[model samples]
Target chain A: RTLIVTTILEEPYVMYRKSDKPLYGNDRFEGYCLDLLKELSNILGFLYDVKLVPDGKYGAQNDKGEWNGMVKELIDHRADLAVAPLTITYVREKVIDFSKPFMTLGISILYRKGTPIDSADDLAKQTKIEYGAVRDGSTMTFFKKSKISTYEKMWAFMSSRQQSALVKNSDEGIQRVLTTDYALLMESTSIEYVTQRNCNLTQIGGLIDSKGYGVGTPIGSPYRDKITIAILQLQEEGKLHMMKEKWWRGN
Target chain B: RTLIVTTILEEPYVMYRKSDKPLYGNDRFEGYCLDLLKELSNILGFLYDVKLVPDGKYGAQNDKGEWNGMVKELIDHRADLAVAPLTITYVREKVIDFSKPFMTLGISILYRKGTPIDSADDLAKQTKIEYGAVRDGSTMTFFKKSKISTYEKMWAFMSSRQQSALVKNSDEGIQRVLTTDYALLMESTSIEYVTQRNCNLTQIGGLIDSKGYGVGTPIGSPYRDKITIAILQLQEEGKLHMMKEKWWRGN
Candidate 1:
């Protein structure tokens, strides 16, 4: 049987393979999530059609509680699985089922190398090193919703300069960090990939939060269990780590 | 409404409080899981009774596929919740539902301080060092079920010397490592707790497998979703880490 899998275009997770010749279908994509989908398909004995989420978002809810991006696709049954760096969270779990985490991480700071910052608190206490996260992303959501005093203070600063502080995506945030005196708040796993590729960029401080990325399935979907076990099996065999090193390998 | 929360007695997760006067009910226990259960109860608005699993095992299936320990309690509807350091595994998830992990960890080698071992492979390749996990625990199960050549070779050695190689629990494994030329394969979180109080022992390697400890509930139980959100809330609020520090702190 075949399944429709929705994913977002994220570097090192899902990226268009640079090719001299045109590629189609699965060949069109190369990265962590693509490899993960391949492994999941191999074990589950199925083929999948990969479609980028129309909205190009990991996922978030509006004031009306309407969901968008890959999450909405799953909720609408347009996607049978979402294999990407989508986080497993409380609100999302209420709407869709997620397998146990294939990868675990948390929000952290991405800054230029040798920045005088050691922790989120250090960033929170200063303004010269202006910091923010990708707009409407989990990292931003974390800062916006956080009740902690340091994060609250940081969010106040970010909200005041929303136009410049919040970038549209990781690429934009990375660009901002390189070109401007700024720090990009994002998931640690993403920071690891970015810092590896760009020696000039370094993650500031330890993780500010902890969460995991899991395969998203429609609520009560039967495939959740099968996919979870396959992921676990791959973890046991060290295939996940190997796959990670394959894509995340940088100078 | 009272929920029966099944747990295993383990230091820093669940342990009897030493008091001059006899302690009873929830008052008798003090540790991370006890704090977790109390927080879950506070949020979910239900009282709980903590019951130690009749059999001292973490759930593992027999050849006949019969499960024992806290897992069986959940499957048999004898407990409403399991709040302990139970490893969330594919086999366990098949029988019962679990909240997102309160603690994510992986199998690692725990050995005497300054051991020459740095990784699982180091010990797996040597015969001078004897190694095993708690009998029927997830660490042992990982080795037994692993198809990886290194683990397969190690399991062959372990099963052959089952009588002396495998300890019955983390406590036994810790003791065995302290007194003998042995390495105890166990979760990294437990190792962190073990190594803290007993400065003589240290985790020998990077994690061998990745997994988490989640609160368990009977399949289809409504509390699973609520408990998951509560756990996530605790994590977001930093209560989980605080609770962990409170229990695992050592001089």
Candidate 2:
């Protein structure tokens, strides 16, 4: 039997229950990625069991081929696959195999009141506007690179340190925006969470770029190709979107 | 009874093919814009007529307020109303009142086979891509400011050139793209012409900004408010999208 390894993140992606005494099995994680794993097993004709690791320590395991983390566990033949919202970036891509993106998401800014400073035309040109984001985050890179206005040509126009702050996630971004005049840029999907809270914040224009989430496997594994194909099949069967709604859109 | 006045630009948008002899009043012009005019008149209790003139001369007349074009004719007591996809730009807005934007479209690119540009991204990248456009044409302006790669980093890359040989209108842009390896950028609605010809050309992307095709009335004219309101009503009713599909698609 192939050992199906999984990790648990917070809600809207992965979930864990307090009642699950030790919390180390399929019971700990149930969401889109979880359902996808079930469908994938049916198509690829694989037998599997889901198990959890300590403090989500499994994902960063690929550093040493024999490490005790999730990726290392998979690479060391302790498990077959790892599924999570686990954002796929270039650095991660180098050490892992990922399927084609199943879902598309972008990051954006939110403002509670005042004219929007969302577009490049407005952000760079308008002197009265102020912006805030996390230190060295994705949005910081976008602001540095974007030339939406002539003022963007000059970095000295606005101090980088003045424009940003270290916030945990969308909740922090929204809290800052609603409580103060400063606009907060964060992930787009985070809006669903912020909106439910019924805060005064509103989405700005749109994100400057789109990122995708995909299933991950150990680098160059023999089963990588078959796993990817299985993932795409699950998507075509409407299992993927249903899985998305089951977690993200569930009331 | 008010006389319906129309200034035409030949086939498609407005034209007289069946008879050169004046067909009593508005009978001469018939198409989607004309049909819209009929609906407006029926709803607002207005009368109208159609008058023909050369394109350049009539446009100049409207700009100069000499009452040569349809709207100007209405203001000058030569006619009562005008019907056509008369463009509504900020410059024109200064002199004449415009209805709510009826058909929002702007310049697009139509590429010939073998052109290096595939998408706007290609046009935006690769200095190898050469372009040609008429003097001060909207297509030329679009290229002057187009950037799809970074979406925000690109400053004005497409510099304007004096290409006297390229045709002045959308047809000319299409011909230039086809005859040369260059891609043609012109109005989105105008690109409809190229698509209808079954050319290999495709619209590169939407314009950087939107412009409206609208009914223009002389400033301060009583009909100005009614005409603008009628356009809003049509838009709210989804009749505009229906009109777009009926006359514009299937080619």
DockQ of each: 0.38, 0.01
lDDT score for residue A188 of model 1: 89
Model 2 Cα lDDT, one tens digit per residue, B40-112:
8877887666666434333434344454455555455554555676655444444565554456555556765
- lDDT string for model 2 (A41-68, tens) is 7777787777664546535433454354
Regions of candidate 2 where Cα sits further than 4 Å from its true position: A1-251, B19-23, B54-77, B112-121, B124-127, B136-161
Error of model 1, residue A86, in angstroms: 1.1
For candidate 2, the iRMS in Å is 22.2
Please give fnat for model 2.
Answer: 0.00
lDDT of 1 at B239: 82
What docking grade applies to model 1? acceptable
Question: What TM-score does chain B of candidate 2 reach?
Answer: 0.76
DockQ-based class of model 2: incorrect
lDDT score, candidate 1: 0.86
Q: Where is the poorest 10-residue window by lDDT in model 1 chain A?
A: A109-118
Residue B56, candidate 1: C-alpha displacement in angstroms = 2.0
Q: Tens-digit lDDT track for model 1 on B60-171?
A: 8889989999999999999999999887776787899888789987888888877567988898888898988888777787788787778899998799978779988777
lDDT per residue (tens digit) for residues A77-175 in model 1: 999999999988888887999987899887888988875678988988887887898887778878887877788999998898777788887888999
